[PDB]
Structure 1
Amino acid sequence: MIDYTAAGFTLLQGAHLYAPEDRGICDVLVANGKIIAVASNIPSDIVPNCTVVDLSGQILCPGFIDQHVHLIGGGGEAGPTTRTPEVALSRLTEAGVTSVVGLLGTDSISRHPESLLAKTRALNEEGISAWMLTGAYHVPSRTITGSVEKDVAIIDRVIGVKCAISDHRSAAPDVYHLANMAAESRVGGLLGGKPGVTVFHMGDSKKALQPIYDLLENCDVPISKLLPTHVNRNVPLFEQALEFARKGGTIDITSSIDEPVAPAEGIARAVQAGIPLARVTLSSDGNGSHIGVAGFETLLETVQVLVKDYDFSISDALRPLTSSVAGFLNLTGKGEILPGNDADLLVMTPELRIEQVYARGKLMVKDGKACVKGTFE
């Protein structure tokens, strides 16, 4: 017989699809890591050596996109001992995360952009999709090529820049160095076909989002490029966060923080405030920070609580972790399960507990446990 295994044909059939839009019992045919067909009842013989897997009674949805993860590690705020380790592949996949954006935090003395980049590429070769934000809390930005504009333009995996404001660990930037910073990420993004976004690490200062509004006054970076994070870290900052989203911005809630505004409660209050889910993202702030290193569970736990204790549909709870993120970061072929896109799907149960995970066509999670891991796990 002729050999067609190169195509890596796979037929996910029988599941109740959520792409994330509620579909019904639909099927998904994969070929070469890409979704090439989405329609109910696809013939199992339609293509050669097709690995047909029956997901009858299962839920099929798009893989998670985590845009706030300390891939190479973080912490260090309480001494060099508090420097957390690098994130393990399996730790992500088992959490549903198929796409991830890495950034740096407080420490940019013992943590470097070239280290984040290399790692970002390790994960890519290992099967998932990884990107990174140049810079860190400190402003001006310590970068790779010498300028933020240049990094976001010429370093492929860089899609924007990070920074901290209204935090006692800030670098104390002025509206000038902050506006210039966001402008370079914008321009560079245009030149390199990247989102060119600016992600602000929100602290607890009373000024809250003030630095941002000042920036909008001092330049012409679209409000759709600024992304405040950890918005649910204190009530008045979350209140302001809602007002921000109202004027067109997209806010980012972190699941790793439970008080004084829980993740689920945050996404819920947003809807109640009339913000389209499209402008609401949920990130994990994974591997940063007993002293304890943050994990990626709270993500799925948000989707669950959203469907179980708030009335969000499965389709809606998925958005802030899928379609919303890919949309804000212009992640082509991601967050959506439509023909053409990548095969980043998760197999779950109707109780929303992950069973299988597919990244670009490969099986990362076979039974809720990773069958694929980092080279030294």
Structure 2
Amino acid sequence: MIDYTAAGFTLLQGAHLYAPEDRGICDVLVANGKIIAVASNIPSDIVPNCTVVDLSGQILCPGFIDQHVHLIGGGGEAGPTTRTPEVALSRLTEAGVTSVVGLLGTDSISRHPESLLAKTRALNEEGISAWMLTGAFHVPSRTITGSVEKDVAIIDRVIGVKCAISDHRSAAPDVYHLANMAAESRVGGLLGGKPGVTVFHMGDSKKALQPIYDLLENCDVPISKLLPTHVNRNVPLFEQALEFARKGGTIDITSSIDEPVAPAEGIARAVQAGIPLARVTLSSDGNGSVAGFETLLETVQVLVKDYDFSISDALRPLTSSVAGFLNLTGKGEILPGNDADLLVMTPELRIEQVYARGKLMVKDGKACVKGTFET
């Protein structure tokens, strides 16, 4: 007997596959954490030492990508007792999240990019995929290397920068500071091979998107690198958000904000407004002040259920659109060559199994792989 177990051959058979594109009943073959074949009727003996998983009657789709999570904890706005705890592995996986982007909020005094970076690396080791944004609400940005441009270019896991505008907790940044920061992230992304995006936490100020428009007139960063998040937090903002997307921008809807514009509602409206799903993303703001991750899946459910979306479409904002926006190669789509990050769900869209890089992380809706110190 020759041992071929090192390959981790796994054949996922019989599910209705949503790539996110609907592919009907189709098989998925994996090896070494990667999707090596996607086709109907793959032979169960095509490769030696194969784990065969019968998924007939179930749905198979890409794992979710949540680009807005306070991995190391957040909060602190009402004093020290309000600092939230770091996020546990199992909380992400049970919610269907296989790829995450960590960031900081208001507090960048007791919270540091170096800590965020360590946590990011820990999660990668524990089995999922993670990246981070440098900076925090504060502008000028507090970085690891002392320069936004340098953090993005040199720190492997950093893909862009975070900031806050139009919010009572911002640093009152002027146009020049915002432009220069955005431009540094853009340039750093080019040199490091990162999307080099600038993510804007939006608050309730009546100035709404104004600062972004101002920025665009004061620099040459492409519109496609600027991401306003929390856009559903207030009406005028949301509306302004729709115009910004119409101009070529991408907008991030927050799943944890249920009023005045609910997440599913926002997504539907955007589509009805003529914005392609490719320019609409959804994120949780998980572990902030603790917001959980269940609203992600719930949004999907609502879209299909109450908004006439097909399952395919409903998945885009959490899969292909994000991956596309952040240029996350090998993520968000079920194609040969991509990472084996997959969800197994019931036809009613309840999570049964989660695989990350080909490893079974959750079974029967329960994490079977946990963080190092998870209790």
TM-score (norm 2): 1.00
Taking the aligned partners of 1:151 and 1:49, their CA distance within structure 2 comes to: 44
Alignment of 1:311-350 (within 5 A): 311-350=308-347
Instruction: Specify the alignment match of 1:113 in structure 2.
Output: 113
Instruction: Specify the alignment match of 1:297 in structure 2.
Output: 294
Could you list the per-position Cα deviations for residues 149-203 of structure 1 after superposition, in whole angstroms to 9, with x for gaps in the alignment? 0000000000000000000000000000000000000000000000000000000
Look up the SS of the partner of 1:130 in the other structure: strand
Instruction: Specify the alignment match of 2:140 in structure 1.
Output: 140
Could you list the per-position Cα deviations for residues 56-76 of structure 1 after superposition, in whole angstroms to 9, with x for gaps in the alignment? 000000000000000000000
RMSD (CA atoms): 0.3
Taking the aligned partners of 1:137 and 1:68, their CA distance within structure 2 comes to: 14
The Cα shift of 1:227 comes to 0.2
Alignment of 1:32-111 (within 5 A): 32-111=32-111
Instruction: Specify the alignment match of 1:216 in structure 2.
Output: 216
Taking the aligned partners of 2:161 and 2:367, their CA distance within structure 1 comes to: 31
The Cα shift of 1:366 comes to 1.0
| Equivalences, count | 374
The Cα shift of 1:105 comes to 0.1
Could you list the per-position Cα deviations for residues 26-85 of structure 1 after superposition, in whole angstroms to 9, with x for gaps in the alignment? 000000000000001000000000100000000000000000000000000000000000
The Cα shift of 1:367 comes to 1.2
Alignment of 1:1-377 (within 5 A): 1-289=1-289, 293-377=290-374
Taking the aligned partners of 2:22 and 2:321, their CA distance within structure 1 comes to: 15
Taking the aligned partners of 1:182 and 1:364, their CA distance within structure 2 comes to: 37
Could you list the per-position Cα deviations for residues 316-335 of structure 1 after superposition, in whole angstroms to 9, with x for gaps in the alignment? 00000000000000000000
Could you list the per-position Cα deviations for residues 97-127 of structure 1 after superposition, in whole angstroms to 9, with x for gaps in the alignment? 0000000000000000000000000000000
The Cα shift of 1:294 comes to 0.4
Where do 5+ consecutive residues of structure 1 fail to align? none
Taking the aligned partners of 1:53 and 1:22, their CA distance within structure 2 comes to: 20
Taking the aligned partners of 1:103 and 1:26, their CA distance within structure 2 comes to: 37
The Cα shift of 1:254 comes to 0.5
The Cα shift of 1:7 comes to 0.1
Could you list the per-position Cα deviations for residues 200-220 of structure 1 after superposition, in whole angstroms to 9, with x for gaps in the alignment? 000000010000000000000
Look up the SS of the partner of 1:173 in the other structure: coil
Taking the aligned partners of 2:360 and 2:209, their CA distance within structure 1 comes to: 42
4+ residue runs over 3 A deviation: none
The Cα shift of 1:298 comes to 0.2
Could you list the per-position Cα deviations for residues 120-159 of structure 1 after superposition, in whole angstroms to 9, with x for gaps in the alignment? 0000000000000000000000000010000000000000
Look up the SS of the partner of 2:160 in the other structure: strand
Taking the aligned partners of 1:218 and 1:22, their CA distance within structure 2 comes to: 43
Taking the aligned partners of 2:112 and 2:283, their CA distance within structure 1 comes to: 22
Taking the aligned partners of 1:213 and 1:27, their CA distance within structure 2 comes to: 47
Taking the aligned partners of 2:73 and 2:193, their CA distance within structure 1 comes to: 28
Taking the aligned partners of 2:353 and 2:318, their CA distance within structure 1 comes to: 17
Could you list the per-position Cα deviations for residues 292-319 of structure 1 after superposition, in whole angstroms to 9, with x for gaps in the alignment? x100000000000000000000000000
Look up the SS of the partner of 2:366 in the other structure: coil
The Cα shift of 1:18 comes to 0.2
Taking the aligned partners of 1:284 and 1:294, their CA distance within structure 2 comes to: 8
Percent identity over paired residues: 100
Taking the aligned partners of 1:21 and 1:56, their CA distance within structure 2 comes to: 18
Taking the aligned partners of 2:351 and 2:139, their CA distance within structure 1 comes to: 40
Taking the aligned partners of 2:233 and 2:215, their CA distance within structure 1 comes to: 22
Look up the SS of the partner of 1:52 in the other structure: strand
